[PDB]
Amino acid sequence: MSVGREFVRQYYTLLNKAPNHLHRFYNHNSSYIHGESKLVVGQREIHNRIQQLNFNDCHAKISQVDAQATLGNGVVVQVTGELSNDGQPMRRFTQTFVLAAQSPKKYYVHNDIFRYQ
Template sequence: MVMEKPSPLLVGREFVRQYYTLLNKAPEYLHRFYGRNSSYVHGGVDASGKPQEAVYGQNDIHHKVLSLNFSECHTKIRHVDAHATLSDGVVVQVMGLLSNSGQPERKFMQTFVLAPEGSVPNKFYVHNDMFRYEDEVFGDSEPELDEESEDEVEEEQEERQPSPEPVQENANSGYYEAHPVTNGIEEPLEESSHEPEPEPESETKTEELKPQVEEKNLEELEEKSTTPPPAEPVSLPQEPPKMHQESCSFPT
């Protein structure tokens, strides 16, 4: 009877069940899942602050796992993905929570590449293992929120800041230029169209004269009326110009 080949998802789920059960209860035997060509990397940084490097082979992986001091581990698996890969292998991705030595739970992501072990059907070993804690990858999200809030505050301050008042120019400079002066006498305005025509005062005065005024006085008044009084300087408005705004077995 030929054994049916399990699906990648069945292989992945069975592996996850066995692996994390051993991690929680007997982590010193975890190295049995690996082979001499396996690689293992566990997230974190070394003493110099550099990211941890991968270790290779079952023996080195065993020492690495022991150095991590797994004790009283509690694992909660939230999600498992498994897909077929090259040479009948299976790639498994796990996401969940891990508490070690009574510490608070931390979110983690772990990826395994399971490779067939020899000619034994449906038997796999861990060829690659990559583990990372989420907070080591993404860090704390609060600084990003702080930067956004600072940007909002700056925008509010810019909105509240009053716009500078327009510079008020000399009221007279937008309307006319200074008149040239010659010999200390100001020349009369050339724009006669803007001057009010002087009203002849002679007619008014003559109307007010009584009929009894002598002819001589009338002649004197007529001579005076021929010379109009000097035009008074035009007073311009003082308003400034307007500006617009904008399933399977495993080694144990």
């Protein structure tokens, strides 16, 4: 759906504006992978991973977005683009999202896999 395309904009807006509040997109059973670190589950710990990742003025140039309906009436999103942290050069990245439709139009990030290329 178009929901995925809207969420990505929200995700990186919040990644840029306030990284320490990005964890509120997740719930107690959310899986998280960033870079190549170990898998992380829960609203906590994910908050701690992002914390030690230390995002500061993180700009994102989104190149490609594709969203599909998936299991449990969820939405699977693939995001391709470039990321910059602390003014460092833009690295090509790839992110896979699984959005869990926690009732009406209230979603939670069930899966987050971020990977630099």
